[PDB]
Amino acid sequence: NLDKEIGQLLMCGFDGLEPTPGIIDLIENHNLGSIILFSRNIATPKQVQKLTHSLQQIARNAGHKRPLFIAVDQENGVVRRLGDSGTYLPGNMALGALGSSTAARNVAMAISKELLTLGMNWNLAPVLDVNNNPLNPVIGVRSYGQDPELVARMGLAQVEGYQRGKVATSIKHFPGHGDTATDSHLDVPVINKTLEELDKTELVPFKKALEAGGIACPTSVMVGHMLLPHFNKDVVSSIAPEIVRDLLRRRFGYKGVIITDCLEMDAVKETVGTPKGALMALQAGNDMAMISHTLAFQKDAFKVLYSALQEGQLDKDEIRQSLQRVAQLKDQFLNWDDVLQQADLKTMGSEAHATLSKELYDRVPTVVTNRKNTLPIRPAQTDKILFLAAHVPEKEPFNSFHASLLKRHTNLEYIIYNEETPDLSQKIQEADWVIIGTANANLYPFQVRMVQQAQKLAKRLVVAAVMNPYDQMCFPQVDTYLVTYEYTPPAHEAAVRLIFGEIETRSRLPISIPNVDDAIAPATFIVDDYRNDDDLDHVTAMWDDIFGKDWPLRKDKINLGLQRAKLQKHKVARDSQGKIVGFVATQIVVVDNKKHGQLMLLMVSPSYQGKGVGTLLHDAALEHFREQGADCIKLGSTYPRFFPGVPDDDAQSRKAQAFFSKKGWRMDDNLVHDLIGDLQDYKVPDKIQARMLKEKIWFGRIKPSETWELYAFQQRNFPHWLSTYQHHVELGDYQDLIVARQDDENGRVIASLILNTTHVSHEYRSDLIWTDDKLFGERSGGMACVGVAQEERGRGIGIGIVAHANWLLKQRGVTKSYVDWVELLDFYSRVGYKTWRSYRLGHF
Amino acid sequence: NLDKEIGQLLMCGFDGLEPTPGIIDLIENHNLGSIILFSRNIATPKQVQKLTHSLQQIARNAGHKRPLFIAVDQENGVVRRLGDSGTYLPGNMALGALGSSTAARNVAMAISKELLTLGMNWNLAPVLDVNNNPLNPVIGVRSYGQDPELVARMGLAQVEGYQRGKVATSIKHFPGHGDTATDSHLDVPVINKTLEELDKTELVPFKKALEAGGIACPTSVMVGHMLLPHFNKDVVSSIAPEIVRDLLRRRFGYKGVIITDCLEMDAVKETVGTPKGALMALQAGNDMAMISHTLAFQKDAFKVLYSALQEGQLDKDEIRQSLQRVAQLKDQFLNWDDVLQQADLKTMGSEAHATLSKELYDRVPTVVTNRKNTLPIRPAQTDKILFLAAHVPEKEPFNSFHASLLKRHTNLEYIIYNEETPDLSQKIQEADWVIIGTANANLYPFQVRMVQQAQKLAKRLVVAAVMNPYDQMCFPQVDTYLVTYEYTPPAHEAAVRLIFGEIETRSRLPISIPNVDDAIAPATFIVDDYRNDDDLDHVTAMWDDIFGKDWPLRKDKINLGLQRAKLQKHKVARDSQGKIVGFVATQIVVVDNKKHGQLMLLMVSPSYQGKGVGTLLHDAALEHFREQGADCIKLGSTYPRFFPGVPDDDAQSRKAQAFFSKKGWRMDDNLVHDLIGDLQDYKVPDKIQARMLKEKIWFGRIKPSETWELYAFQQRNFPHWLSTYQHHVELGDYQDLIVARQDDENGRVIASLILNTTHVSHEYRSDLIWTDDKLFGERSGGMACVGVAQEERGRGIGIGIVAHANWLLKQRGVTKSYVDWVELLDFYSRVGYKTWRSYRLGHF
Ligand SMILES: CC(=O)SCCNC(=O)CCNC(=O)[C@H](O)C(C)(C)COP(=O)(O)OP(=O)(O)OC[C@H]1O[C@@H](n2cnc3c(N)ncnc32)[C@H](O)[C@@H]1OP(=O)(O)O
Ligand SMILES: CC(=O)SCCNC(=O)CCNC(=O)[C@H](O)C(C)(C)COP(=O)(O)OP(=O)(O)OC[C@H]1O[C@@H](n2cnc3c(N)ncnc32)[C@H](O)[C@@H]1OP(=O)(O)O
């Protein structure tokens, strides 16, 4: 009935660097729909492309309707299956400490690119567990931090990032594994909390992800293994319908794929059979069962499901809906052509991703205490440095630390200390500097003793914790302590750079360290909602301060720009004393029925630039868009607008272009221009008069009863402008809506454009805001949305109607004319317009 | 201015039950604007009225422009000044535990009523401090609870309630005194937190309150005395401009009054002079200084300000702004007539408030643990009960507790234990039941010993913590433990009621008790936003369960009512398993440019009524209105609409009316009716045909070009209906818009009404939803917004246009006609309408 088809509901691993006979059977006979891989299987880039293609080949020959999913746990920091095949980029708490959702988004994009070229098309990530427990072993630095809002902010960003690169996601571990001291792999963790308690922390990031507007909403959710007595005290969360069906499916109304964590962990293997745990998972409402590692359970589980399917121990109607959800998920990401074609090995962003890693990691480690100003250290060449590193329970992970120390200082001793290590007192007292490397000392007593010992003896001690940042809770006497949030080579490089004062701590602890309350606070800026009643004068002053030379702009024009923005969301940045230091403007517009986010303006005061304020505001902007589902984002705005893209005619502006591309904005190669035209003594050239006379073209306004003819025109020929014409009509600016007609005032509309003139057009028209005496004057105007019908092209009408528009402006007393956002410079050269300012567009 | 005027910026108290020469001097000569009273000054209702009236007269007599403010700390739990002059109603944590914002609002209203009648017109309250510290001596139960969101919720509701009752407020203590173990009256409390930290908890309730839309936004804010080293490490927040101006005035942009806590507290007096401190307070940016007790300081402080005014040590410009803010505030609440009248002491709601006290306190105390099912106790008359209570550091608080037990049991011994108390072991073992009253045992070790002692010896133990609820942290072994949240007499009464099983625990701990993980969790219901894609069928089902008998209503009509709701915010209530058990519907509409909140519908499944679900949904709705500033609230809705008020034709609906009035809704004495009229064979009466023909009145549809004539009519004569007409015009239903014109189809508009007809009117018209075969059926229609110009009344037009309306409807094939929400029954009786259903309206 559904015997072969139920293979799509599974995900299974294997051992080695090429397909086993096991998984070949499962795929070919039992229609297995998803694979999972680990470092065991990741040989190296060439081997993996082959491996993924091999599995894919066998799947197609075996007659699968859709291609396999090939999943992996790529969380990036401490946990990372790529190894040396792919780039080291910051893991979760590292990113949390870094504090930029944009940074995290980019990391996920960079990773998905790498995974997709190798054949991975499903990253089991991100982790949305919240780390409010100092002693959490399993989810330590795998969580972004202690604050559920920070976890949401960063989580959404990565789900976007990964899925933006055509790779599926799984937010985990539902309902929240971050609050326990118990490890899921070893024992059964208990979360003794009610739904009300869960709503306040655990579920915050999950709720926010599920409610995301578009690409930032995850495509699957993973249910970990934890006991929740207030919901189900008999069985673990993955197989309890109170957690899966009642909470995730019913309450939250989640329509996507639900999958389990590995059913071979002791939390479910030592409560029931892993083949039994597979049945109870799908009974609870899971769409999918995970069985990584040991084949035998994979065989059993399959036969367990077949028999249960015969009885009626599985609701056949529910399994159909599950198979439907898995089909939908596959159709979103998978197609046979490019799944088999494979991409070239150089299409991994290896070089670009490498320079991202260097750039990010310099902003990661935190100096937590520095009571004696030991850091930065500036030893003399002949000073003896003792570097003591803890043993690990990857093999010698503190060797990269050692390497990085060597680049700065060679008179160095490197010892890996453990429980057995003979007494090192004498070395500690003799050395001029002692550096100790802890790795979860708060879980490994020998490290705490080592640090406490050295504290008594060392001349100058510094302690770097490279796993969880909580270690100093065990030795608060230590005056100088820092954290790297992960033991990766680049995290150690950055940690050494920090120690030698090459770099400066910019990150902020995403965590509380118990018994350590004098944490060092960097200068912090906070983002509030813009309040026009209170903030307008300051924003006005900021504009003149930054743009006043080339773009002087009075308070009311700024206010017009800002107050008329659709679905607006403007923010300011304030220092600790509430003084405004930066501003960002923002609107959302619908085009083709896609939400479009427009970043209208981003600016910060000169004396406060280069402190991360721009980045704060910028992230607040994209985080808002992200939640709203504004997935197509633009630099500058259409209407209303300060700039259509990024100014190009001064250095500070071009510098701001680099700022934006470096964050991930795709800037255009070519420029875009605003034109200026003198009309002092403008006459319509005779050739055009004669042409328009010969063609029998009529120009003039549209009347209210004729509006439909102008809308009909725009709908057929320039639908992207209809809303602009409609906006003016709402204000009653009919005198600015000029049309060309055939023969006379009753002929069909064959062309049109939008005039504007200072003091004539409605006060809420932002067509021309540059009315300062040093730019365009009082006696100023312009035109826009110029267009001729397709049928009527090549009769000289376009140049006619523009030339007429110039005449009309001259009639109104206009001496200086503004043609905004155009490219055909030779066209407007024929009627006296030379270029005024240039911009480079950007989008995302 | 300016020296006389500065007295308006001061608040001073005094000794006795009549004016001292001291304050008489301050009022008469120094222009003191505000008084503060304490228990010293309150003896009895009669004498307080005489006191407030005397103070008020002297101010009037002495030539004050505006009345004195008369302030008091009336927090209602452990902090009260009224004593027995006013009703005992639940203090803060009692209300947090109770869990209803409507209950907190209703308390404040009752208290502001009692205060005003005595001449007290400023309550220094509510406390928005968040109590996340288990050891907090000041601000224990004075805080609503641990969750800042709960504190905001209740805080807004009380600020509404007090100001609703024409009494001023001061939210306190900015920036948030909830997190310390140090007491402000004794020593300087330190809050070592950054702005970013404070924003997470301390400042949440203050921000929520400051951003409230209308009456729930507070009119003053008090700044406590606490050291914040990250902002200012030299002086306490009261006199630190980094807290007062930079944070409250600039960053939050608050425009109301800022006032200090008492400048006589040791935090201010023992750091710097109390006179000196008043100068620094106004320098920091405070509007108003408090000096509650000592005449010498009140005298000196004034002398310090007069000299400070001379130099220019005070920004004179800033003082004028302050004086204007005080003037603003006084003008909002105070006028000489009411302030000099002494309202009858019958107009204190004493008997009603007594009833409220009883009703609420039954929903207050919580049974926290009851492992042995000791509660409820059922002692035989001859059993011996021993009651041991802690000494206080009032009188003998647990006394009332003693009196309450006596009523249930005669054989009872009562001993107030302390440190000196000789051993009591013998009586404990001998007693059948032992009851121990603790009063912050976690602060007083002798109580912990006493409980530990009894834990082993006593036969059957129950422990009642009557101050802070945290006491069981000191003795988790105790199986049977309850808490009252305050030692007021009715809190104790309710506690005893719970002990003997007369009542049952309905509250939930608003707090976490350390070392007690097994709290008795009652079965709870959580409220989410209504999702129409998931919940429509269930809400439709729920409708049929509850109203299906007399009001059968199809899904699409329910969906129309709900989706067309303006500024909608609908909620559902689920149980732990996500099953929907209740629904509330809501919209906001603007009339006279005030926001009007409309409670469209409130319903819960029958099997789930009487479990607090209606209250949960109800409060969620009122919290939303309160925040939005929708201060005029209605039962039912205008357009769209299920009901215009509460139905009256069945018992369940009449019972639901009681439900609303108990919560404080004002229900009308009279009813309001929907009408039904059979048109099967209707004819226009001959007398009316004549009258119309005689008055030469013309009827017919309004044409699009004539729309302005209809709007002009409605504007001049029925402004409250304009928006409904406009709504129908947007849909294009001109064929339902009938007018009366003078002679002719071109005559002035003199009357109008709105028709509707099933399958003829636009699909989004909700005029008539009752189209079920058993109600009005498919051949159905109606009229609304029937109105004759005031200059044209008594020409039989009203009856003419309505008689015409029936005719037109009959022309359409309508047999049953719906006239909704009317009163003039005899009028519609003349055209064959009898009453169909009746509703009682309700407002707040
Ligand atoms: C569509 C439009 O909005 S167009 C208008 C854009 N505005 C302008 O053209 C002119 C005004 N420009 C500005 O206000 C600013 O220069 C902005 C908005 C472009 C950037 O604001 P800033 O606060 O300087 O940004 P931020 O401080 O995050 O700068 C990031 C860079 O500064 C450096 N930096 C930031 N903080 C630190 C720190 N604590 N220590 C050392 N270096 C730092 C980094 O190198 C970082 O990356 P990059 O050098 O690779 O670019
Ligand atoms: C605009 C319109 O909506 S028109 C109104 C139309 N709606 C209806 O008529 C629907 C029919 N009625 C109902 O659905 C419900 O009865 C409602 C909505 C009126 C009230 O909902 P309920 O859930 O019953 O209210 P709730 O349970 O909060 O309180 C009801 C009573 O039970 C009591 N109660 C609640 N929980 C408990 C408990 N755990 N133990 C003991 N008593 C309790 C309350 O104190 C209250 O007592 P009171 O009668 O002395 O005031």
Residue numbers in the entry:
A (entry chain A), B (entry chain B): 8 to 400, 408 to 858
What does the study report here?
In the present study, the crystal structure of full-length RmNag has been resolved to 2.8 Å resolution to find that a unique GCN5-related N-acetyltransferase region exists in the C-terminal region of RmNag, which displays glucosamine N-acetyltransferase activity in vitro. The crystal structure of full-length RmNag reveals two distinct functional regions: a β-N-acetylglucosaminidase N-terminal region (NTR, domains A and B, residues 26–529), and a N-acetyltransferase C-terminal region (CTR, domains C and D, residues 537–858).
The N-terminal domain (domain A, residues 26–371) reveals a characteristic (β/α)8 TIM barrel, which is typical for catalytic domains of GH family 3 members. The C-terminal domain (domain B, residues 372–529) displays a 3α/6β/3α sandwich-like fold, in which a six-stranded β-sheet is sandwiched by two layers of three helices each. However, this AcCoA molecule and the domain C are unlikely to be directly involved in acetyl transfer, mainly because there are no residues nearby the acetyl group that can be possibly involved in general acid/base catalysis. Consequently, the acetyl transfer activity must be located within the C-terminal of CTR (domain D, Ile711–Phe858). Most important, the conserved tyrosine (Y842 in RmNag) which has been predicted to act as the general acid to protonate the leaving thiolate anion nearly overlapped with the one of the HsGNA1–CoA–GlcNAc-6P complex and it is therefore within hydrogen bond distance from the sulphur atom of a bound CoA.
